[PDB]
């Protein structure tokens, strides 16, 4: 059982449930059992068409998730049955029950962390951690600002930053129960939570007098919101973009580039993974797993949905005001989900 | 005789001709005679209000130019009468006949290069050279793309790049005699000259098959034009912005930042000058002067206008389709200008 698309378009209509047969297990091959796989923007964009990579249709959707190794090829010894794995590369097709992959296509992850955390490791904490490390040299006490803070990545940024002794200013969209949301992000380690509406005020720049100007800003919104994010950076600061929409480009005023000497950059985890070794990626995973055991990092609220009920999850993920992230689940759990 | 403004606004109405008296020459002071001074965007923005710095009104306008040292203070020995000087710092007020400055406010420039070239040294070639050096490591054969190529900076970029064995793609705005303009920029060393209209075609990216993708783009336009400039960069390339307008921000698509790993930066010569020593700035000037003697760099077409006829020059500089640059001239010449 697989979630397959015959062409590119709106995932609602484009993607459908189909049945396949599993290939032979060569000496280098690993047969797995999928446990869980998230619906990520990249997955949606790979269905829609506008994404960096596009596999050969008819293709299986989804790029991330976690699977248990069930059977193993003649001469693979680095992966044993019972090991949890995640994809080493993009476009593997993870919205399936079982598959066969070469051992180089897979990366072992420890099987003692929670299943949800394993499934979202790449999109969320891997991305958050990398952005915090790769652009500005941040020491305990330094600040970071970000938008879409209630997102999967946003919540990972909050937790990881706090683990690094950093001080976060967290922008979220305006909403009726901002107070509840504010309090929850603060419990995760957020120092401040402000709305986009608050961000746009000229009196925002030096609003929080008891903390230093951030040299790092993380953006997922674009448009005027990204410009207002830029505006909060110290001189010589960097704003990193890791998501957004086609028709909402990042916008940088001439005066901010020139007089404030700001830098705009992107981050793409897939690119990072390609430019680095398995050991370096394994090192990142271990670091994150240690945070998850030390209690310094937990996964956000995520609605579990069966592979059968993909339609429900596929449309709910494509809310303009994206609520809880949708995790496709291939296992049964203690509480049954119809 | 001085060009003075009592407040900020439209330079046409704001700036006016006034008479002052010259201060005492302290031990550290240098009395000069202004020879020429350009009308630069920064000068206009310093009159308008929206600029990084704003001196104390009533202030003298203009930030750049060249002057001959006429008289010198008790204990200054590094500047002799007859030496040409340019301002070491911004906001000196150069739209004057004579003044008194401290020797640290001035920088000697060789007096054997043409007067026009001395007057525009900072805005034009200093800025062009710095942008070519400070962002991407360019070796002979590498390409650079830029827009507003017919500008003062644009023409300096063309000449300096050619001197460095680089290969330029030069974007200009669409116009009735594009051919004449194309030919002139090519004679200066431009390899290709294309219009903004041509740039916007999807078929532009690999249009010039016989040259490598630029890792450096220089932008002065913003808006959709800057996005199309960005689009021509090799993966990991940098677009540097050194001018533009308030209501024409730079626009960077999410996909270009993320998938192409592009960098957006600004450049401000005033900032560079502050972050570096007099010797390092002197080194830049000497390099440029050597290019000017070697015949590798000449100043563009520039209409000379007397200090008396500033109004004419002040409005002509503020064309939306800026023609020949306006140089305020304090000297008489072989051909008299009424
Ligand atoms: Cl937000
Ligand atoms: Cl707060
Ligand atoms: Cl142009
Ligand atoms: Cl051409
Ligand atoms: Cl950078």
């Amino acid at each position: 059982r697989a979630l397959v698309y015959g062409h590119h378009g709106d995932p609602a209509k484009v993607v459908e449930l189909k049945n396949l047969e599993l290939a032979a297990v060569r000496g280098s091959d690993v047969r797995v059992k999928m446990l869980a796989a998230p619906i990520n923007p990249s997955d949606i964009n790979m269905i829609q068409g506008n994404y960096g990579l596009l596999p050969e249709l008819p293709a299986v959707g989804g790029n991330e998730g976690v699977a248990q190794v069930v059977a193993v090829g003649s001469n693979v010894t680095g992966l044993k049955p019972g090991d949890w794995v995640i994809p080493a590369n993009a476009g593997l097709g993870t919205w399936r029950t079982e598959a066969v992959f070469s051992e180089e296509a897979l990366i072992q992850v420890p099987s003692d962390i929670p299943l949800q955390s394993a499934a979202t490791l790449q999109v969320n904490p891997c991305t958050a951690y990398r952005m915090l490390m790769d652009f500005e040299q941040l020491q305990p006490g330094d600040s970071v600002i970000q938008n879409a803070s209630n997102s999967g990545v946003g919540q990972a940024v909050i937790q990881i930053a706090a683990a690094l002794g950093l001080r976060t200013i967290n922008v979220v969209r305006d909403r009726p129960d901002i107070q509840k949301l504010s309090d929850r992000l603060k419990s995760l380690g957020a120092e401040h939570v402000i709305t986009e509406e608050e961000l746009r005020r000229p009196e925002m720049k030096n609003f929080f007098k008891d903390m230093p100007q951030p040299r790092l800003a993380l953006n997922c919104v674009g448009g005027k919101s990204s410009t207002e994010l830029l505006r909060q950076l110290a001189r010589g600061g960097t704003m990193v973009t890791y998501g957004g929409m086609a028709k909402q480009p990042v916008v940088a005023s001439v005066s901010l580039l020139i007089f404030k000497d700001l830098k705009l950059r992107g981050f793409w985890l897939s690119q990072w993974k390609k430019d680095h070794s398995p050991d370096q990626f394994k090192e990142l995973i271990l670091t994150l797993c240690d945070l998850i055991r030390r209690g310094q990092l937990t996964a956000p609220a995520c609605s579990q949905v069966p592979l059968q009920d993909y339609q429900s999850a596929l449309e709910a993920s494509m809310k303009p005001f994206i609520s809880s992230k949708q995790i496709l689940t291939m296992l049964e759990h203690h509480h049954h989900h119809h």
Side-chain angles (χ1 to χ4, degrees), chain A:
Chain A
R1 278 152 196 76
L3 258 53
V4 172
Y5 58 111
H7 64 281
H8 295 250
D10 183 36
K13 179 57 191 291
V14 157
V15 180
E16 55 184 315
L17 197 293
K18 295 205 185 180
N19 292 29
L20 289 69
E21 51 170 313
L22 294 100
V25 190
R26 299 293 84 182
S28 307
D29 288 348
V30 192
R31 179 188 164 179
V32 303
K33 175 149 160 42
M34 277 287 147
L35 312 184
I39 297 166
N40 298 332
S42 53
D43 309 323
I44 295 164
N45 293 333
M46 203 171 295
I47 306 314
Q48 283 173 335
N50 63 325
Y51 198 75
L53 180 61
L54 307 174
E56 178 199 342
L57 20 73
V60 174
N63 297 280
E64 295 175 25
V66 58
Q68 183 203 136
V69 176
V70 301
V72 122
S74 179
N75 43 43
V76 300
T77 63
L79 287 182
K80 295 289 191 278
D83 293 348
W84 282 10
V85 294
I86 67 174
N89 321 121
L92 280 208
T94 62
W95 294 349
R96 271 185 287 192
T97 45
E98 288 155 29
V100 182
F101 302 119
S102 63
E103 75 173 330
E104 260 292 297
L106 304 167
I107 299 294
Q108 185 175 166
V109 300
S111 63
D112 63 325
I113 69 178
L115 194 138
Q116 289 194 19
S117 296
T120 61
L121 210 51
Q122 306 201 65
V123 64
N124 291 346
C126 281
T127 305
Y129 183 94
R130 293 263 54 91
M131 285 190 298
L132 288 170
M133 296 298 286
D134 293 350
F135 294 101
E136 294 283 340
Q137 174 183 190
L138 299 175
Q139 314 289 318
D142 295 340
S143 61
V144 181
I145 191 170
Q146 70 170 342
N147 58 26
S149 301
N150 194 39
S151 74
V153 174
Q155 293 192 41
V157 169
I158 284 164
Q159 297 187 84
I160 298 172
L164 296 163
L166 305 177
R167 302 174 68 188
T168 55
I169 301 170
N170 298 281
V171 187
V172 296
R173 179 57 102 80
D174 302 69
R175 61 160 77 194
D177 215 345
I178 181 59
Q179 206 181 11
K180 263 57 173 61
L181 173 57
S182 180
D183 288 348
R184 207 183 68 255
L185 299 184
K186 286 187 185 190
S187 76
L188 292 178
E191 188 163 340
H192 295 120
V193 180
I194 61 173
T195 63
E196 289 284 358
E197 188 266 330
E198 279 178 312
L199 187 64
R200 282 183 253 114
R201 294 189 181 284
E203 300 89 345
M204 169 60 213
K205 190 194 287 296
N206 61 333
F207 195 34
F208 301 119
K209 298 154 191 170
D210 294 329
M211 78 184 312
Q213 296 206 264
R215 304 199 302 279
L216 183 66
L218 308 180
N219 170 61
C220 206
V221 179
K224 297 324 303 144
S225 306
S226 59
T227 317
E228 298 300 337
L229 207 67
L230 264 184
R231 205 175 298 282
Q232 312 302 316
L233 282 174
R235 200 178 218 161
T238 301
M239 184 170 76
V240 179
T241 294
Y242 67 92
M245 305 187 160
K247 294 205 167 182
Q248 276 145 17
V250 172
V251 178
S253 80
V254 171
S255 60
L256 287 172
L257 288 168
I258 297 186
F259 311 131
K260 301 270 279 284
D261 189 30
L262 306 183
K263 325 183 205 314
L264 279 73
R265 302 283 308 264
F267 179 76
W268 193 19
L269 182 64
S270 289
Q271 190 58 56
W272 189 88
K273 287 168 56 164
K274 285 163 66 175
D275 304 335
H276 295 82
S277 71
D279 280 5
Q280 290 177 312
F281 185 47
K282 173 265 212 176
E283 180 59 35
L284 175 59
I285 296 289
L286 281 180
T287 299
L288 295 176
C289 289
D290 287 334
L291 299 179
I292 292 168
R293 294 189 197 99
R294 287 165 194 183
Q296 294 182 298
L297 173 65
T298 64
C302 288
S303 308
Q304 295 188 150
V305 188
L307 193 71
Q308 305 299 293
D309 308 351
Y310 65 92
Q311 180 57 53
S312 172
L314 218 43
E315 84 162 310
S317 55
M318 297 182 72
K319 284 167 167 281
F321 48 101
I322 307 172
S323 66
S324 174
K325 170 155 282 202
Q326 307 304 298
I327 309 290
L328 288 164
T329 55
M330 294 79 170
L331 301 182
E332 270 289 298
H333 296 105
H334 284 288
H335 283 318
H336 174 79
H337 201 291
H338 178 66

